[PDB]
Amino acid sequence: LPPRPWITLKERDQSASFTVMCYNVLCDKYATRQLYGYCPSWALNWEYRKKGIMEEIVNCDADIISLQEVETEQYFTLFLPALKERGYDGFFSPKSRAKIMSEQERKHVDGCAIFFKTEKFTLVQKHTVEFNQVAMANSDGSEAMLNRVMTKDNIGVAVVLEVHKELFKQLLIVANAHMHWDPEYSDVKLIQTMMFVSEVKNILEKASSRPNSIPLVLCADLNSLPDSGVVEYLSNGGVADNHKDFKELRYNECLMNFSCEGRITHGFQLKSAYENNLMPYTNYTFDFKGVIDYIFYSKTHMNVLGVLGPLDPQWLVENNITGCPHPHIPSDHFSLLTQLELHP
Numbered sequence: 001l002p003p004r005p006w007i008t009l010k011e012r013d014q015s016a017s018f019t020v021m022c023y024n025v026l027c028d029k030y031a032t033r034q035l036y037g038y039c040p041s042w043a044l045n046w047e048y049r050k051k052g053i054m055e056e057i058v059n060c061d062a063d064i065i066s067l068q069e070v071e072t073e074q075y076f077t078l079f080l081p082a083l084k085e086r087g088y089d090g091f092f093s094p095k096s097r098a099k100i101m102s103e104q105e106r107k108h109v110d111g112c113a114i115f116f117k118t119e120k121f122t123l124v125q126k127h128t129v130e131f132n133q134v135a136m137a138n139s140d141g142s143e144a145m146l147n148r149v150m151t152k153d154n155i156g157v158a159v160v161l162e163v164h165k166e167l168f169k170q171l172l173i174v175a176n177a178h179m180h181w182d183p184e185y186s187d188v189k190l191i192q193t194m195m196f197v198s199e200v201k202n203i204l205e206k207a208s209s210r211p212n213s214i215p216l217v218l219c220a221d222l223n224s225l226p227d228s229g230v231v232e233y234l235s236n237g238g239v240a241d242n243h244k245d246f247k248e249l250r251y252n253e254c255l256m257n258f259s260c261e262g263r264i265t266h267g268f269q270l271k272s273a274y275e276n277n278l279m280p281y282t283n284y285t286f287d288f289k290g291v292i293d294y295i296f297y298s299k300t301h302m303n304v305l306g307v308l309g310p311l312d313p314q315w316l317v318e319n320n321i322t323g324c325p326h327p328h329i330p331s332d333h334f335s336l337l338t339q340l341e342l343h344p
């Protein structure tokens with residue numbers, strides 16, 4: 001397994017630089033022979049894969065790490081203890097807090113974690129966004145909001161961090177979400193994204209009023225290709241309320257609850273670190289290969305200096321690798337890694 005390359009996109013000036021990782025590790029619960037039958041059982045097994053997962057994370061050595069598919073017990077016994085030793089602290093929330101289940105099932109619920117190096121950042125606030133609660137609260141007048149959106153218990157997490165002056169009070173919000181997966185539910189994915197951005201803006205308003213100005217880095221497994229309403233909404237500061245992906249009700253007035261006519265907008269002016277298909281895919285399986293993971297950043301606060309390019313495709317060809325995971329690749333997603341430059 002050859003080390004991944006690095007694409008330089010812009011030189012360092014000559015004021016704060018830091019790196020961000022985004023990585024869906026593939027949780028044990030979903031690593032089944034049914035879905036990944038082309039991978040031998042011994043290489044699917046968590047006791048085997050978790051080693052490759054930790055190696056990938058250690059090798060990337062990112063200042064900030066956003067993971068998806070982190071199982072609750074594994075956050076507390078594997079990811080946090082190990083990354084504490086590398087100088088990180090972390091924030092984790094699982095999905096399904098409100099769902100009733102046994103002690104044993106609770107250990108295996110997955111969720112999102114953000115880690116940050118404490119020599120560079122200090123935690124100011126931490127937040128969990130429950131898309132099912134936000135949908136329920138904004139569902140008046142929409143059966144679809146209640147039937148299709150509220151019933152999915154996906155989440156995102158966000159932290160407000162202090163960026164230490166030595167790297168140049170400067171604040172930074174890092175947000176990390178994992179959206180619903182089903183290709184037939186583009187509406188849910190889009191609404192979940194608008195709910196998340198909307199709630200992050202509410203978080204940001206309450207980070208400022210404590211004696212628009214705060215940069216955002218948004219990591220996510222959006223389960224959405226670059227041509228989707230989700231990515232258009234994130235990249236262009238808004239989306240039409242009649243966008244095809246809303247699958248009717250399109251023009252529902254309930255969408256405007258997230259919406260700051262006909263356009264649902266946000267003011268974050270985001271850009272994707274990997275735009276212009278610098279990786280041809282982020283999820284790589286036999287049945288599906290495509291870009292569905294993203295690192296977005298406030299383009300008025302930050303430059304992209306570089307990204308970690310894709311695993312060499314001739315290597316996948318020579319080794320006949322048509323899907324992941326694989327004995328040498330421990331997740332069906334490739335990690336994303338970017339170096340950003342923050343100008344206060």
Ligand SMILES: NC[C@@H]1O[C@H](O[C@H]2[C@@H](O)[C@H](O[C@@H]3[C@@H](O)[C@H](N)C[C@H](N)[C@@H]3O[C@@H]3O[C@H](CN)[C@@H](O)[C@H](O)[C@H]3N)O[C@@H]2CO)[C@H](N)[C@@H](O)[C@@H]1O
Pocket residue numbers: 026030035178179180181182183184221222223224225283285287288290292
């Ligand atoms: N062809 C339609 C496309 O599907 C893509 O996603 C693919 C994949 O991510 C997703 O399914 C994947 C596939 O392993 C297989 N279908 C089992 C399982 N559902 C898994 O979904 C899993 O669960 C999480 C739940 N939260 C997902 O967010 C996460 O990406 C994934 N680990 O559905 C697609 C099937 O591969 C993208 N959503 C988008 O490109 C478009 O919708």
